[PDB]
RNA sequence: GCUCGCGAUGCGGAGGGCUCUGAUAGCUACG
């Protein structure tokens, strides 16, 4: 036990509550207790667990760390060691997500923050913990329903909350190139640098950190949380509410015009998306016509870490890939819980997948199920919108800077397919599962990105 | 003693009863602590004399969202009468045992070699199942008290809830109609807060009656085994345990041979047993004849007090069908249908059951009365 | 006979807070 070790250790000691929230199931508790000075916290459902994270945080800083579950530990990054201790990062992401969601919801008041997943991006210039910035910040455990697609790409098709806060970064991305690509000393501003092997790169010590409330669905969560001591293939989601399923590498394929008779769209799940992410990188098809290759150093889950499963749905079950185009390469990231997991709330998902980026006013909400903001307007976020971003940079690119010949660009997947190194790695991720024999990913229909911004 | 109906229901009442506690101190022990009582009873014989008690086990809940097993060593529902049959599943593999230890012994096993293949029951040897109360689902909801005798019966029998499959539902009251929009569960999904769903008792009773009591691991030995009666201690409205044991699916059709709508006998006892004023207990006991005392699960894990497996969870019992398995000679087996051993697959071998089991759902689908509700089957898949 | 909507009175597994009793294991002070 932690409070009892803890007011053995240094019996003159008094706790104290801070505030409280919630109602029902919903009820959040945190409490701080300051041993020798130095000051700690901790929070969970009831008052007692809230108290006894606390003294678990004076216990491990203060004198040394409790009989610990080793599935609990965290796997070190690929090559480096270089901001801060992983626990100690994990943390601090952790409370900076929870910051600017606070933030966004007035202090958790707004009926938005009523959340089931929480995500978030954060960037860090170098190892002072005042170098983070939070990128952006995400909510919602749905997807569009088939009859909500559109062919024009106005439509948000995954609105799973970390998906949605990689396509927030994505937004944070093509702003840092607009700094870029304006008057010349804003250049020293950027987060960008012109790339020696042509177009443009990352300037040195700039790391991207990935925060979900939970293990992402599919792989990353095919376990018994309570019995630690496992196959690894690819699920698709499903179209009731949350969870996923595995796919047939080997049946029949689906359309376009089928979400009006029997055999529907299939999106893939969050695991083998982060895996997708940790192959091909985060910056996708038509930004990598621009920048060079861009990974995440870490991944933070907030609840349901096990280190055995996540380092198998991220990197580990596609060891088999080879033929990496050039700087390419399989990211093998920080993998890391934190100390006070979030607990289960049973009950219902939200409709709502809630979004923000650095530099925007306030938060942006998005009906999951239909794809589209709350007053049936098309999101910042959604196919349509990203590439007229995309497209204000291609104009304001010099051409000899381009990462590939893409200068009259009309159409969605066109420009997409003008990612000639890009698309390469994609075709190498694809066939390292299926050689795996985990399965062949559902590729949604190319009529959705048969559109222009015409 | 040839008995009526009430004099057999107040009989086992009786019994179930005293083996409670005879295992619980004289109902002076903590464990005896209980909302609902269950068990199965033997009989082999028209006389109050020769007629045992094979299980008795006590619960009224189901197991926490997160704590569900890859490995099947934890245990789901333990609703009382959920609890009693798989006691009587382990019975069941004792006299398995019993009648392969050798020719000397076969002769006070309870099965022989049957005509069709594999083991069949003795002859005039059939079981009991008791109840203190009334089962989860259809026969419950709609009258969850007493009778009041100047209350005639259920007065709306068409309207369109009567007979519906229900769920028990975590973290919330009630059993929950399924309407055959019957999305089943994932895993991912439910470790993040999706609510667990479990087939009501009554779901689970009509189920039993029509495929039999022994799963399809023991099918794959023993010809289906089915009650003969069920005995109600407390909240019995004929019409609607009637309607809920087997008169919903009387529409069912092209079953497996040797399998039937069983329409067992269904009974009240002459003097209820009482409200059970305090808490409801977390814990099940249980206990199979034969056994040296009770076992107590705690119902939210499935697990004991101290984290060890039942000797009643999905992996123990693969256990005992395994070392049945090795002793069965390939011309005794009901299906000589290979399947790897794995939890899952193994259940699969069992063509005919798995095939009454079809037959059932589409029964309970075309009634109108919604889609059974499997687990994620990724709990089912594990070896040893 | 039902169905759907809206009321109303009731019936049937989670979470949180407090109060009291008992036992356990440590911890002090005291004579
Ligand atoms: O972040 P997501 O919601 O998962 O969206 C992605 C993203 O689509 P957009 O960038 O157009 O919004 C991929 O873009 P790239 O990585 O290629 O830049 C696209 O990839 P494809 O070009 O392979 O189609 C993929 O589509 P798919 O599901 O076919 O892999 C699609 O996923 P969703 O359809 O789930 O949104
Ligand atoms: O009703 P229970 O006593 O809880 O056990 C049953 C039993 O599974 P086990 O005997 O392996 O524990 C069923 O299997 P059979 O005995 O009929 O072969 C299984 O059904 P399936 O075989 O159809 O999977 C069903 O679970 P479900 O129908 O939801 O998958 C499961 O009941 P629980 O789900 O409540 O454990
Ligand atoms: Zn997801
Ligand atoms: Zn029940």
């Known amino acids: 036990?932690?409070?009892?070790?803890?007011?053995?250790?240094?019996?003159?000691?008094?706790?104290?509550?801070?505030?409280?929230?919630?109602?029902?199931?919903?009820?959040?508790?945190?409490?701080?207790?300051?041993?020798?000075?130095?000051?700690?916290?901790?929070?969970?459902?009831?008052?007692?667990?809230?108290?006894?994270?606390?003294?678990?945080?004076?216990?491990?800083?203060?004198?040394?760390?409790?009989?610990?579950?080793?599935?609990?530990?965290?796997?070190?990054?690929?090559?480096?060691?270089?901001?801060?201790?992983?626990?100690?990062?994990?943390?601090?992401?952790?409370?900076?997500?929870?910051?600017?969601?606070?933030?966004?919801?007035?202090?958790?008041?707004?009926?938005?923050a009523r959340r089931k997943v929480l995500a978030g991006v954060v960037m860090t210039t170098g190892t002072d913990v005042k170098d983070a910035k939070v990128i952006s910040v995400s909510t919602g455990t749905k997807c569009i329903n088939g009859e909500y697609m559109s062919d024009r790409g106005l439509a948000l098709n995954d609105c799973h909350a970390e998906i949605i806060s990689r396509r927030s970064l994505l937004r944070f991305l093509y702003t840092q190139l607009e700094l870029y690509l304006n008057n010349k000393d804003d250049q020293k501003r950027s987060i960008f640098q012109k790339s020696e092997r042509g177009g443009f790169r990352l300037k040195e010590n700039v790391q991207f950190h990935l925060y979900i409330s939970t293990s992402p669905c599919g792989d990353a969560r095919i376990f018994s949380p309570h019995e630690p001591i496992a196959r690894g293939q690819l699920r698709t989601k499903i179209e009731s509410g949350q969870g996923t399923i595995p796919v047939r590498s080997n049946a029949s394929i689906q359309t376009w015009d089928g979400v009006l008779q029997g055999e529907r769209l299939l999106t893939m799940s969050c695991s083998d998306k982060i895996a997708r992410w940790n192959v091909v990188g985060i910056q996708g098809s038509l930004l990598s016509i621009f920048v060079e290759p861009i990974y995440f150093s870490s991944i933070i889950l907030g609840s349901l870490y096990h280190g055995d499963h996540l380092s198998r749905a991220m990197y580990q079950r596609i060891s088999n890939i080879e033929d990496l185009p050039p700087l390419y390469t399989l990211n093998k990231p920080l993998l890391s819980g934190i100390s006070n997991a979030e607990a289960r709330q049973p009950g219902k998902a939200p409709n709502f997948s809630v979004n923000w980026t650095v530099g925007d006013s306030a938060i942006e909400v998005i009906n999951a199920t239909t794809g589209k903001d709350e007053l049936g307007r098309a999101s910042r976020l959604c196919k349509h919108a990203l590439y007229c971003r995309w497209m204000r940079v291609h104009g304001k690119v010099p051409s000899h800077l381009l990462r590939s010949k893409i200068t009259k660009p009309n159409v969605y997947h066109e420009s997409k397919l003008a990612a000639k190194e890009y698309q390469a790695a994609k075709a190498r991720l694809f066939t390292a599962f299926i050689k795996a024999g985990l399965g062949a990913w559902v590729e949604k229909p190319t009529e959705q990105d048969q559109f222009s911004l015409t």
Do not use: C, W
């Open 1 to 112: 036990n932690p409070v009892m070790i803890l007011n053995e250790l240094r019996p003159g000691l008094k706790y104290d509550f801070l505030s409280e929230s919630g109602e029902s199931h919903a009820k959040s508790f945190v409490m701080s207790v300051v041993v020798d000075g130095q000051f700690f916290e901790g929070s969970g459902r009831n008052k007692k667990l809230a108290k006894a994270r606390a003294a678990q945080s004076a216990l491990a800083a203060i004198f040394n760390l409790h009989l610990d579950q080793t599935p609990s530990r965290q796997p070190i990054p690929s090559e480096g060691l270089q901001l801060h201790l992983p626990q100690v990062l994990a943390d601090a992401v952790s409370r900076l997500v929870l910051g600017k969601f606070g933030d966004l919801t007035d202090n958790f008041s707004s009926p938005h």
